[PDB]
Amino acid sequence: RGKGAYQDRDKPAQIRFSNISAAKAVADAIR
Amino acid sequence: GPLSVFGDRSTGETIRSQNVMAAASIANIVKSSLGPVGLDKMLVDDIGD
Amino acid sequence: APVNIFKAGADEERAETARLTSFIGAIAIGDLVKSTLGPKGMDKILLSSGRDASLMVTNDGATILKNIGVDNPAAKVLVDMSRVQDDEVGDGTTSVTVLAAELLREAESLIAKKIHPQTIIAGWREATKAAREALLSSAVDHGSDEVKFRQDLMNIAGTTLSSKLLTHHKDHFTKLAVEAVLRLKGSGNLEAIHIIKKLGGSLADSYLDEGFLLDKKIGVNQPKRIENAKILIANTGMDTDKIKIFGSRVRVDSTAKVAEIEHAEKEKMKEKVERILKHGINCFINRQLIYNYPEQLFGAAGVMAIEHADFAGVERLALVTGGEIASTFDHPELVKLGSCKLIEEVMIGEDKLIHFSGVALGEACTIVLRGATQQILDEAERSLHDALCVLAQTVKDSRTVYGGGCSEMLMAHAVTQLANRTPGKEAVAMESYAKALRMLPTIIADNAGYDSADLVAQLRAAHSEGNTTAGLDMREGTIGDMAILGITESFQVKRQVLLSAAEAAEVILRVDNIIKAAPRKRV
Amino acid sequence: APVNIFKAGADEERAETARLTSFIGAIAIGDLVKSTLGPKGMDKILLSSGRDASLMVTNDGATILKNIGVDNPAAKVLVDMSRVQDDEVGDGTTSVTVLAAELLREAESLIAKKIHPQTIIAGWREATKAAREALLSSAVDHGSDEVKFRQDLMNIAGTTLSSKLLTHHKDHFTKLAVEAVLRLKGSGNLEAIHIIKKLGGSLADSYLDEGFLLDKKIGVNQPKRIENAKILIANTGMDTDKIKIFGSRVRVDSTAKVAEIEHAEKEKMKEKVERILKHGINCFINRQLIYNYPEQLFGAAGVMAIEHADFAGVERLALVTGGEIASTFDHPELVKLGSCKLIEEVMIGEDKLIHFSGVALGEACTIVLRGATQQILDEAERSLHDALCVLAQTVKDSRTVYGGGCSEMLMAHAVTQLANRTPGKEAVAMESYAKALRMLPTIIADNAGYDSADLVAQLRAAHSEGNTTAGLDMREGTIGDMAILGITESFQVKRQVLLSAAEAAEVILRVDNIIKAAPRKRV
Amino acid sequence: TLAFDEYGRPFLIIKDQDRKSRLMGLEALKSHIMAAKAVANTMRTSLGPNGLDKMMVDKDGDVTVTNDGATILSMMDVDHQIAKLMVELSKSQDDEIGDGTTGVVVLAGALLEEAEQLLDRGIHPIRIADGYEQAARVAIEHLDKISDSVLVDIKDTEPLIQTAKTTLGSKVVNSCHRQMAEIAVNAVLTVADMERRDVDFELIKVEGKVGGRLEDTKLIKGVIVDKDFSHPQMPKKVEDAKIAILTCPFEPPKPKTKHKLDVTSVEDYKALQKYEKEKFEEMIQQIKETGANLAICQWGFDDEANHLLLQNNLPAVRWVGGPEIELIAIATGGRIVPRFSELTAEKLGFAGLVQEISFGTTKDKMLVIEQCKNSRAVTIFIRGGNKMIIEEAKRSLHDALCVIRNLIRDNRVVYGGGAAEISCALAVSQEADKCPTLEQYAMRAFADALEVIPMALSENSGMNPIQTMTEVRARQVKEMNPALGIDCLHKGTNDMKQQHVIETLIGKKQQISLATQMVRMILKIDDIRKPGESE
Ligand SMILES: Nc1ncnc2c1ncn2[C@@H]1O[C@H](COP(=O)(O)OP(=O)(O)O)[C@@H](O)[C@H]1O
Ligand SMILES: Nc1ncnc2c1ncn2[C@@H]1O[C@H](COP(=O)(O)OP(=O)(O)O)[C@@H](O)[C@H]1O
């Protein structure tokens, strides 16, 4: 069996990548 | 994605070529006023001086 | 795609506002036509902003959705769903819109329960398969014993017209709808029943004509009534023929030869009419226009001439008189003529119409709708069209189910019995399918003003132990037997309500991204 | 009122869009802070459009709603509800927002059931009365046997800090919060615990100071540390007195008399300092500013002088040293002095602060918060403020209930037991009250990613037959006993979650007309 | 400085250089990855049998719910030249194979995401592109290991049905998962030339009409056209039809040039009447002398010729399209005759039940051809509940007609469900150590990007990506690697050979080949010369 299924249909999975991509631009600016 | 600054960012050899042309813009002015064969200039203001 | 957007004027959303705009736009469509469902539901009046607004009141759910022009992308699926329901069975366009909206309303309740949307699709496919067996095993067939089939046809027209403007006219309009399809005696072409709308008089003054009515009255100097006539129709050109030779001129040398050609042209037009009267007829119907030169020839011979009836007017006359079109007149022994008794002209609403009284082999009817306003006549035409289309398919498929909420509780019982024999992953989606099927008798019960919380609870307790014919009694406001009261619907109508709403809710629930393009000329 | 509108720029709605905008605007507030509830919920970052935006991350629901600025009229009732919850008990502002929104979400489900809204109000008043008896009968008191009360206080701070940014700091920040209120030994003034936020270091480097910290370092030519000193504070003016006679000048005839007056002014300012040092002190704290002329007098006598600490800084020094304010110096036998051991200066984050080490009767604390950024220090200050306010009321009301979803299932069980002993008019409203109480363990279970459809179903089956201490175990993801795990909350915090959400949902449900006036400077 | 020289002169190189945009930098490669990852993250949720569909709205307001990757990227208004190459990548997969249009965009976005971390380590972008060619070559040779089919197009249609169920399993036709899969198998084998291994899709007519249900979709061996009987009393059912296909309108013969025929006397005008009266009797008798009882005409009919059809018992349709009558002459075995004088008994077509069927209350009356005799042209009649489920089924079944065409071109198959991507990822990792000289990091980025496609199936099925992929990949190393993938309901075991998840070899062979070459054209670019505003 699959032992459950957790459907996560919400916003902040995409905003979490926005904080990652913004902090990568700061680290590459003063690289 | 990129930097979210509200100004302007230029990297690479763009500013490395702009600073030389900024220094050559000043040197090409004062190159005509060096030595005994140098000649004076005129500095006219907006008010007429 | 919202972050670092690479679109010009187009916007999109993924799994956050995609299902949010799909559930808002689809429920608001179903909540719009929610008040028009049932025998006690009100009607809507549709209006525009101006520039020949042409107000058209309709209670049928297909005509409401086809004129509103919804800007929501997911709401256009339910608009197109009710369009196919009007074109296939002609009824249940309002019932398929509320049922498809109640499925997505129960699917919106599964948002916070963190159910996967593919599990709801797999749970509803097993729920729809259990609901097909509930209607198929409860369908009542009718073969022989035709005195029970004609009584069964009046229960179909009495159920359809009860949810329309013809409320207190079931003693008359049921006989106008049953006998119209009963006079077809064949295929349901749905065009031999020509409905004529005339102002003046009440809806009780409307009647079904025993013959056929027409316009474009009989000539100038021709007889108005001929007893025991032979009707011959035509689809040929009478005058100014220019017969089929493109690039042919009359190149003569003098003007005296032009007078000989134009006399030879009128002799061939006279010889064509002389070939028509060799059949021994008294009436003539041409689909094209009849000019003055053949009109004098029919008037001198005592023959009628009906010019430019309709393109589909000669088809109804060929089915009500028993003749043929006969566009070529060169064999009188191979042309079958029509039959009639009286071709007198009647006056309905200060307009003289040609009444074909006493026709033989009359497989065509004429409903003379008379109403108080034009808004009533436009509503009664669509109300009769929603009743004749079901009876044209009830004679093709004699299977009938018990309506009035009885069919929905039979479908909801078969899903709930199989929801307990399933694991808990798909059993929650099957219980939401059965709750949406019980909403369809809840909308009917609450539109009258009854206690909808208790009547559907009495229907669920009745169908749980026997009572396969128990339904909702909208007359007194209680629970009664549907076989005694005579509230039945067709099997193919109730199947298309269940099947098309389950397929349309499958499409909208599977949408996780709505990428709309940039529109043109919208700034 | 919409038809023939007698308003200028104001609009209104009655019973159609009034409850529609009230249910949309209140659910969107509750669904916003839904993701911040529980020990596994995420946090929000609040930002403005510009002009000193001052980003402030908060997980507490009161600080989120007090800064968003909602334009909805009915949403401001739930915004003001969370402000009172922070001002009274300081915790449960997120729990009272979702519970008041889940009541109105179930009230939106009673729209289509045609239930009268006054029946839902009268049904919830009987439901809230039964829910008060569930928390009152399950409250655990603590009188004597104080070794179990201090263990009970760490379970209160362990539950409050679990839903904040201090996740993996319960081995340190629980001792910083329990011992801070334990050193008060009296009333919960909530101002003797001065929290100092300094950048540099991790959150594990933060500590509770055994003495007291201050700013405005000791003079210019004064000693920096005095062992075994007597602290005397003051609230008087030192120099440029202009003593209380408005309209008094020095009207002399020559400039030699002005030199005698200004020498008499400095003699009275010197005589004021000579009355201070007769007490035999070594430190001096003035609430007002100390100028250069009394600063030389304290430096010549070897006495410290702390100038202009704070208005509330002399109150904390009076509670940590055991003295008095002593604004008038004319009775040395009636002025009580403070006591200390070390007044050395310590350096925390490249800033020299005055450390009052070894003080007597120290009913005041100083929490030195050290964090990576200023966003963590602003969040850990509000996280500690939400933890110290509950322990300040737990020592006043020792009644505690079992949290972690255990208290909500006890409240929902008492409503469901009385929902079956009522007629069917108000029983449907009581069943919606019990379903909204079960949503509060459902939001906590679904925020971690667990199966919320099964864990709350196991909590309902556990509380139905015994198991008064059974709750949700967020550590492993199962059902455990709350008395063994030690997840308890205060009784007054859980009572204000139940009572304020039932009163706020009573106001919004009773609104049938929203008449908003014309705003100013909005065009 | 820009737009000015050091001597004070204006420095203008190109026209309108102030409103230009030029990026060389180090973010020009970074802007290509972030624009391509957002397209791959959009298409990631529509992969596999649990892939959710997307709602596309056109510029005119028309809404089409699509799931195939070819129509999704084509109906966008994306004005980005990097993402425009992803549209042509999904279009190139549809034109060649037509099954992995969704998977070829997620794979191309996976190769660029793994190349982003390789770019920060100092590797040249062409050195990553040269490393992907040496890594994709291992994936092609490893994919040809286990491949066999026993299709004979006589009775062993069981590998053909299970191949089409893998393509139709991800669409919305899972209610007709067994019925509609057998339609696309028999539609190809009746029209394909097995001697040349060539399939022509012009012989397979895909028509659709609203009404009925999805279970009413039947494979009509013949043609389905809009019947336009000019006479309303025409018989609507022909038992044995001798079809006379002609391309001449029922009229007197009009030439193609300018004539201006002259009439002088009344004997010439009476000769005009007898010329047309004998012409309509000649065009009707020349059909009846051949023994025909059905006529097809491309152009219109005259009113005089309509009644002559009813007197001679000769039903005929009117105004048929161009390629529609081309399908009648192949399905009936007849010949298209230009004139009426060239009619004979050998140029007639043979058909069985020729009838028109009215659908509900509409007035379409399409043609249904039940019986035939060795036809090489079939017609699929797709029915449904709305136009959203029909236009998608026209796109879903077209992908099922393409995977049977690919089996005739190449009779080698693989096993999908992520089983071929995990097995190909192990082949690159084994050859990354033989030898790890320069392109060791470029081959491991290829193997980590090949695992994105099976881990996207684990994400859409509600499982965990890194938990399920570690279990399947470890079982292929401890023993000999079987057809081991995943599924949605998982069907018990994870063996793709037992679950009958069969995909074509050349389908996945072009997925790795096209995504590698499209990555090479978006890695080997270091400048963007886009303009500014529109005007
Ligand atoms: N006499 C009656 N007793 C009980 N129910 C009735 C009666 N007449 C009509 N109804 C119900 O009213 C509903 C009307 O649906 P309708 O709006 O006609 O659907 P559609 O728009 O698809 O034709 C039917 O579903 C039927 O069950
Ligand atoms: N260790 C734990 N086990 C179970 N539940 C917990 C635990 N810690 C906190 N919780 C729950 O998390 C919730 C946090 O609520 P909170 O947001 O602090 O409310 P408020 O904003 O009113 O202070 C509490 O209702 C509590 O029941």
Ligand SMILES: Nc1ncnc2c1ncn2[C@@H]1O[C@H](COP(=O)(O)OP(=O)(O)O)[C@@H](O)[C@H]1O
């Ligand atoms: N029964 C199944 N079990 C596991 N995986 C499956 C099953 N059916 C389909 N799949 C997977 O779903 C994917 C669907 O890809 P698809 O979007 O059709 O590609 P394309 O867009 O090129 O047509 C296939 O790669 C296949 O591996």
Ligand SMILES: [Mg+2]
């Ligand atoms: Mg009806």
Ligand SMILES: [Mg+2]
């Ligand atoms: Mg708390």
Ligand SMILES: [Mg+2]
């Ligand atoms: Mg596919």
